[PDB]
Amino acid sequence: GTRYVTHKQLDEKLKNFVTKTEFKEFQTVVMESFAVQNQNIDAQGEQIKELQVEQKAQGKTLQLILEALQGINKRLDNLES
Amino acid sequence: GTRYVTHKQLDEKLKNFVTKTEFKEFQTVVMESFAVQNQNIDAQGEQIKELQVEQKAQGKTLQLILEALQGINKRLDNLES
Amino acid sequence: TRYVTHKQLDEKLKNFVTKTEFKEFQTVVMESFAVQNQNIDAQGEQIKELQVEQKAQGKTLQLILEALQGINKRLDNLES
Hints:
homotrimer; mainly alpha; rod-shaped
């Protein structure tokens, strides 16, 4: 086994290398991990979009209120001294 | 013996394979990175929840204002006959 | 035999992951984390935007509440 590699020497060498079995096993764990986190990230993006629309709606309502207050103040001043 | 692998050819061939050490290091950094992301994603989830509560709270305030404005307008209608 | 043939070696290494396969996956994982960071940063910005808008509107709402107080007083004067 001095010039060429023997089966015992190869097996011994291969003890320190990664098998396809181990590699693929880990790949599935990683892919499923990204899947669950990304699903959470997407769900939160959805909640944000929902908040954004309501925030604009509220800003619209507020603007209306500010106008109404101006009208109320004009009517009050109209009856004032 | 020309059909056999020499020690040098084995070493060269193994240059293109992964050691358990390299793989374990990668696994750890990856799983550990997912942990960090979990912290980040959950933190934003909590920030979103707080935005939701505040938006709902302010929405209620807006409705109270809307109710107030109508009562005012009626008191003004009565004053203006 | 007891010596490894070129073919036997090839056959055996087929059950081990190649450096190229591994490197490809590693790059894919790291770039995927990069994308998550991209989206997390973007959503963080949207969150900050909403936080800023809410604080602002919160201020205005309180002012409005006060304004209604002064309006009710003016009305009471005109009626009560």
